[PDB]
Design a protein around this ligand. Structure first.
Ligand SMILES: *C(=O)[C@H](CO)[C@@H]1N[C@@H](C(=O)O)C(C)(C)S1
Length: 263
């Protein structure tokens, strides 16, 4: 609905920075609404969903196992590793790492998984192979959050991320069991409270993944819908703002409120 675009423009006024937005129909892939859909924005932690999508594909192909245990050390710990820092002694399984990377946005977990698949260059190749010639991962955590103005490293476009997420969640790329596992991890997101979730009505479904980086970079990708079933994909990214985290959170939540109101 165009009233949501009014709010998105208002968010740009409030934050003094670009805001990229897209609403996509999950079933048909039809673009319902867009704002700067083809401009690049840093992915930040939203790439973690793509990463686990690549891991799940390897599992489907028998090249990896959900139960395989990874024995890392304190040398691997990077900033913001709430889960991995507590399991140094016994390590964690691939399933646990993806759960941690998605639900808690654990940085070390992402790096560990990144190594198992072959690094940023393999994740980018995976994306390219599934039709996404835009999204690219170049660095590891935490460097990928730099958000240098005009830098194309570690970026995506709202339309690319949206269509890629649709394919991962509903396409034939992953087995049904794996598609469900990915959605299950996203639905269990514990760190996106003040964003779209704060505007979600009772009974609605939401599977998401947020990100922060930087130069005011903030973003979120989500699959949501009424009656406990997702029917649309929403992608929101912003970068460049000098506003506080709270201010950025509020704007995203208000865009969400408009989106829901005009569903
Ligand atoms: C990803 O953008 C960062 C780690 O690089 C994680 N996601 C943030 C967020 O979504 O708010 C975080 C502060 C939970 S850490």
């Amino acid at each position: 609905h165009p009233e949501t675009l009014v709010k998105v423009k208002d968010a740009e006024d409030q934050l003094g920075a670009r805001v990229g937005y897209i609403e996509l129909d999950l079933n048909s892939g039809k673009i319902l609404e867009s704002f700067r859909p083809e401009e690049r924005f840093p992915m930040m932690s939203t790439f973690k969903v793509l990463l686990c999508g690549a891991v799940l594909s390897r599992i489907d192909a028998g090249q990896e196992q959900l139960g395989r245990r990874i024995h890392y050390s304190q040398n691997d710990l990077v900033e913001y590793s709430p889960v991995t820092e507590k399991h140094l002694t016994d390590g964690m399984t691939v399933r646990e790492l993806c759960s941690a990377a998605i639900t808690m946005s654990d940085n070390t977990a992402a790096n560990l998984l990144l190594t198992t698949i072959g690094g940023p260059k393999e994740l980018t190749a995976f994306l390219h192979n599934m039709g996404d010639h835009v999204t690219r991962l170049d660095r590891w955590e935490p460097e990928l959050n730099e958000a240098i103005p005009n830098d194309e490293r570690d970026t995506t476009m709202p339309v690319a991320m949206a269509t890629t997420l649709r394919k991962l969640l509903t396409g034939e790329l992953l087995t049904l069991a794996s598609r469900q596992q990915l959605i299950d991890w996203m639905e269990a997101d514990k760190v996106a409270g003040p964003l779209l979730r704060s505007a979600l009505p009772a009974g609605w479904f939401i599977a998401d993944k947020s990100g922060a980086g930087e130069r005011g970079s903030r973003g979120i990708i989500a699959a949501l819908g009424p009656d406990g079933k997702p029917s649309r994909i929403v992608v929101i990214y912003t970068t460049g703002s000098q506003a506080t985290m709270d201010e950025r959170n509020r704007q995203i939540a208000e865009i969400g409120a408009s989106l829901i109101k005009h569903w």
